[PDB]
């Protein structure tokens, strides 16, 4: 009552016992703190089997094994922004059937020497569909995503893909190789659109972060002997309730082969990886003229 409730942990669900001799709560000590979302929980584990029994979003239906091998990102279903989180005073448009639907991007070919590709979201859907038109026309954008990476191969083919959702996937460069150039990635590398961008150094993900530790992020496996598809339902994560869809990518979808594709001669050498993504609970605010970027 004698101090401002202005620390960085106000509004949280944990009571912090602290010591404060000042007027502001942020001046106080760190104090004490008086399935798992980070383990890529499934739809069965999230208790969301009712929303995944048959995945039909908009006028689009994907046929895939549900519930058990279908991942909800960070244990959070996508949802519309609440009144408390939202700051923009104009009411956003929620098309929900013209923009919330599965879009099929491209059919990148998986080779034995393939390195991997990344897709930046919603940069992939910036210039196609009613979702693309709404993203170009509105300043503010907020949506979840249902990424359904598909890679069909025969029972005599082998290989696994790490289909992972990397939030705020900032692309770094080789810095001239010697590390003394301060180079920056181009626009076509940072926001490669629907056709994506191939990883130059998949070990560091072209960002200096190991590919091995990518599984803390919402991830899936397309181990070809077990599953031919990877469904990751991805919520909207940002420090902001809304953001621009043209100059900020909320996450990047990494699809790299951890285990190389291999098959004997005679089998079909064209093994394509098809990226399908459905925006979920899309919210567009701040309407003006359409801008490509």
């Amino acid at each position: 009552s004698h101090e401002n409730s202005n620390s960085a942990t106000e509004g949280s669900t944990i009571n912090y016992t602290t010591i404060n001799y000042y007027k502001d709560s942020y001046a106080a000590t760190a104090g004490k703190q008086s399935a798992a979302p980070l383990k890529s929980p499934s739809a069965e584990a999230c208790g969301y089997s009712d929303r995944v029994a048959q995945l039909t979003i908009g006028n689009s239906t994907i046929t895939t094994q549900a519930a058990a091998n279908i991942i909800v990102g960070y244990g959070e279903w996508p949802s519309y922004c609440s009144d408390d989180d939202a700051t923009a005073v104009d009411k956003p448009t929620r098309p929900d059937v013209s923009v919330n639907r599965f879009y099929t991007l491209d059919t990148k070919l998986w080779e034995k020497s393939s390195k991997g590709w990344y897709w930046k979201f919603p940069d992939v859907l910036t210039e196609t569909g009613v979702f693309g038109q709404n993203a170009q026309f509105h300043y503010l954008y907020r949506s979840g995503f249902c990424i359904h990476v598909q890679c069909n191969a025969s029972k005599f083919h082998q290989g696994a893909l790490l289909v992972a959702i990397l939030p705020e996937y900032v692309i770094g460069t080789v810095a001239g190789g010697t590390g003394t150039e301060d180079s920056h990635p181009p626009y076509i590398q940072t926001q490669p659109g629907a056709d994506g961008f191939e990883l130059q150094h998949p070990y560091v993900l072209d960002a200096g972060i190991p590919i091995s530790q990518l599984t803390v992020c919402p991830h899936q496996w397309i181990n070809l002997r077990t599953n031919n598809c990877a469904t990751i339902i991805v919520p909207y994560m940002n420090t902001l309730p809304f953001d621009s869809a043209l100059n900020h990518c909320n996450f990047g979808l990494l699809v790299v082969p951890i285990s190389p594709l291999d098959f004997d001669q005679g089998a079909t050498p064209v093994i394509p990886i098809t990226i399908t993504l459905a925006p979920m609970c899309s919210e567009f605010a701040g309407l003006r003229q359409a801008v490509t970027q």
């Binding site: 519309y80 922004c81 609440s82 009144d83 408390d84 009411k91």
Partner: peptide, 9 residues
């Protein structure tokens, strides 16, 4: 949590 969704005389 949003609350915006015969003629007479």
């Amino acid at each position: 949590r949003v609350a915006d969704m015969n003629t007479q005389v």
